Chain A
Amino acid sequence: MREIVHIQAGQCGNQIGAKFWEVISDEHGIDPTGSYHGDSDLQLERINVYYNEATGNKYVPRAILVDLEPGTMDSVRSGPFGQIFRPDNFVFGQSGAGNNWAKGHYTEGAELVDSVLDVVRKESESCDCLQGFQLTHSLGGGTGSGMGTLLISKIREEYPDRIMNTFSVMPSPKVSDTVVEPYNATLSVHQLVENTDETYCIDNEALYDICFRTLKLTTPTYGDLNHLVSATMSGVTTCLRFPGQLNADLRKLAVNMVPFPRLHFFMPGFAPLTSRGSLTVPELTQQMFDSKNMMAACDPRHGRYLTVAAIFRGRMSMKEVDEQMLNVQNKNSSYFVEWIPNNVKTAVCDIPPRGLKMSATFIGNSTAIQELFKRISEQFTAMFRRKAFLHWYTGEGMDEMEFTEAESNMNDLVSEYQQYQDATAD
């Protein structure tokens, strides 16, 4: 269990994806030219999980960059780490998908799908022992959502015994008021429930709410929202990238975090929350469990934790962390299911992120996530009831029964979360 093949699809997928490579390259001592300038031998110990070793001891990201819109490739290259990507790993079409899930999944997206798979095969066969895949995408557009899910199902057919993990960005009218986004997101959730092993739910609603109410930015931008996303992606991948006592991989996280196959949607969290260009263990434990630090717009105190994983980064007493973790499970006991014993796992990493002396990253599988699913469901139903813009989808080959089926699956998912929230250990 070593290498990860990362794929980034569509505009949101590529922008969050680029920020991820920039942030983790900095932590690992890697520069935009691909050379290692780090001071700690702990930065190269598990460097092969995300980087390919190349001639001249150059480190190339095992990343594949995909979009139906061509202009995206130009924005990726013009970034700070733009030239670090493999020039052959860019698969870009000519005609975008204009927020149409059907275009991404059935017509324009399906034409460029065998091309992406050729690049996936090449990176996968060059791996000593492939762990699985990591996809970054939004669910509200057409390419990341429609083509992204198609790519997932295709990869799942070729590599069934490997883990499929996604960083999926959920829509909010607060960031984008494009009324077809609940359609696109609901169609994609229907695919994600079946075809991924683990999904990090990154909600634009929560990101906006943090920037506006906690960080006091009255006009938040994509840059501002992506600053919370990059810190979250850095934190949740800490244990895949740094040695530690645990030899963590994507499959060990799945076995331990996911008790029922469909309930694989995680609510990530981060502390401390900070803005661009601008702490003790008890405070960090508290903040990490506060609804205002969650990356999904759900109150954890409205549901119950099935499983939790927490990563404390920086220099600190491991005994103090053990003490505070047990303390948070005592006073907040009614928020953990009593039928999954020892369901909170903690790791400590010596290397902290950029700009922070200490940090904590939370990964929760909570029944409170049903709030996020109900919000999108209510919007999908308001639109679907009036059959608004339905022809934009059915004209691409889609059957109206696919909408009915997607809505039916997402409501079944909410009922399943509610079922385990009300279950007792008797």
Chain B
Amino acid sequence: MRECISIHVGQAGVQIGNACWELYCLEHGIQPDGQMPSDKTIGGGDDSFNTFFSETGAGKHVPRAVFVDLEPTVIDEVRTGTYRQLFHPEQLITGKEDAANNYARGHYTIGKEIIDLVLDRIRKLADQCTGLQGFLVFHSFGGGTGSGFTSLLMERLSVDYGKKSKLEFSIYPAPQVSTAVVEPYNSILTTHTTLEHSDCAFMVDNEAIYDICRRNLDIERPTYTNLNRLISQIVSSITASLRFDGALNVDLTEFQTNLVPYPRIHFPLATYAPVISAEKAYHEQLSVAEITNACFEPANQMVKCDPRHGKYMACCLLYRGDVVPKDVNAAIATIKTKRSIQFVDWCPTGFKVGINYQPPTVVPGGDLAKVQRAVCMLSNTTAIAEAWARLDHKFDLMYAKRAFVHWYVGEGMEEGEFSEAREDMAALEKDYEEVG
């Protein structure tokens, strides 16, 4: 048993954080006050759920989690909602003035006023760990806090916890539900400054989630509540191997070994199926073959891109539910007779399989129907370079005119940082082109 600390930064990181810890509580049988009757070892333990939850002498199971935001209105909802007693109040940190959608304010000027308090509170969590494996960092690309504060935090965690793994869950901007015109700027700045400090990062394209909510869930105009509920289901499927017994991705190090062949190309694509509306309570149950096939349909992807246009370097299939291992084998064999699955010649063409035999949990008040089997596929495909090019093009249109740059320069940032960040993204696009 090796502990994992989750850090949630800014509004997106915090709201997504709230929806994940609610779902984790439901999967492990933990009540909103922290009580867990199925845990025979009171006041301690070495079980798999202990990687995400510590225990007090009173039987209270507390999330190993820190919530930080430069303004207090989003975290105040956590302080007063259903799970207000679950987190330790010193684990929820807020400033007074936000980064105003500006990377430079979150990183340089406003962010500096709270960085040491955040690091000292994370150290209190780390000190209670027997064998800390690392950190899960949740944040948007587009916000001033999600972009700038996250990079300052990632820089400082690399100095103070040098040997520990760092994994991100990052929200990639969408025009349909964005806040600022400068989100492309914030996105490229945070990508450049975090690249060397992160071992693996799962990007969640808000446009992909928005499209799935509309198409599969019949939700006319999806709100953040609908998006976050779907995101938390996918994040739960990715983290299940860390919190339950199993043979695949059992620790943070193994996510790097399985999904990251080279340090810079650390952005795996997640695909999830099936996504069925809760209004279809009596839906037909999809076979292991049908859900497996669904993983190769661009529509079910967490990042909009076409894997038929790229090559695979790794592919992991994580099943949950009534899934017979020989049926997985047969579905994979059928899928291999397909020209759209091209692996790079230097990687084995294998699919790694992990099966958790408990069906997924749905949260009361959610949009999804219950299913007897689900699958999350994690793959490292060069087709995710399409996501990077769309963001780089938006950056280029503005940057050519230097539009909005004075706001960044006025908050202690040099104009040369914009070109150094863009040059790094040009190199990253070439890294994907060199692989294939």
Are chains A and B touching in the complex at the 8 Å CB cutoff?
yes
Instruction: Give the interface of A toward B (CB within 8 A).
Output: 1, 128-129, 246-247, 249, 251-252, 254-256, 259-261, 307, 318-319, 322, 338-343, 345, 420, 423, 425
Minimum CB–CB distance from A311 to chain B (whole Å) comes to 15
> Can you name 15 extra interface pairs (CB under 8 A) apart from A128-B96, A129-B97, A252-B100?
A1-B98, A247-B73, A249-B100, A252-B180, A254-B407, A255-B101, A255-B182, A256-B181, A260-B403, A322-B221, A339-B400, A339-B401, A340-B181, A342-B175, A420-B401
| Distance from B190 Cβ to chain A, minimum over Cβ atoms (Å) | 16
Interface bracket on B = 20 to 34
A264 to chain B, nearest CB (A): 11
16 pairs across A/B with beta carbons < 8 Å? A247-B71, A249-B100, A252-B100, A252-B180, A255-B100, A255-B102, A255-B182, A255-B407, A256-B180, A259-B403, A259-B404, A260-B403, A260-B406, A339-B397, A345-B181, A423-B401
How far, in Å, is B286 (CB) from chain A's closest CB? 30
Distance from B364 Cβ to chain A, minimum over Cβ atoms (Å): 24
Is A341 within 8 A of B184, CB to CB?
Answer: yes
Please indicate the chain B residues that have their CB under 8 angstroms from the CB of A322 in the complex.
221
Q: How would residues 381 to 409 of chain B score, 1 for a CB under 8 Å from any chain A CB and 0 otherwise?
A: 00000000000001001101101101100
The 3 closest A-B pairs by CB, nearest first: A259-B403, A251-B100, A339-B397
B→A interface (CB under 8 Å): 71, 73, 96-98, 100-102, 175, 178-182, 184, 220-221, 394, 397-398, 400-401, 403-404, 406-407
What DSSP secondary structure best describes chain B's contact surface? loop
| Structural contact, A341 and B398, CB atoms closer than 8 A | yes
The distance in angstroms between the C-alpha atoms of A255 and B398, with both chains bound, is 14
List chain A residues, Cβ under 8 A from B102.
255
Give CA–CA (A246, B175) in the complex, Å.
15
Smallest beta-carbon distance B368→chain A, Å? 22
Assess A340 versus B398: contact at CB under 8 Å? Given A255-B404, A318-B221, A322-B221: yes
Contacts of B101 in A (CB 8 A): 252, 255-256
CB-defined contacts of B100 to chain A, threshold 8 Å: 1, 249, 251-252, 255
When C-beta atoms are compared, the residue in chain A nearest to B176 turns out to be A322
A341 to B403, CA, bound (A): 11
A259 in contact with B394 given A307-B181, A340-B181, A343-B181 (CB within 8 Å): no
| Contacting residues, chain B, for A423 (C-beta < 8 A) | 401
What separation, in Å, do the CA atoms of A113 and B108 have in the docked complex?
Answer: 35
Contacting residues, chain B, for A1 (C-beta < 8 A):
71, 97-98, 100
User: Who on chain B is nearest to A338 by CB?
Assistant: B397
Task: Please determine whether A259 and B96 come into contact, CB atoms closer than 8 angstroms.
Answer: no
In the bound complex, what is the Cα–Cα distance between A236 and B401 (angstroms)? 28
Check B220 against A261 for contact (C-beta < 8 Å): no
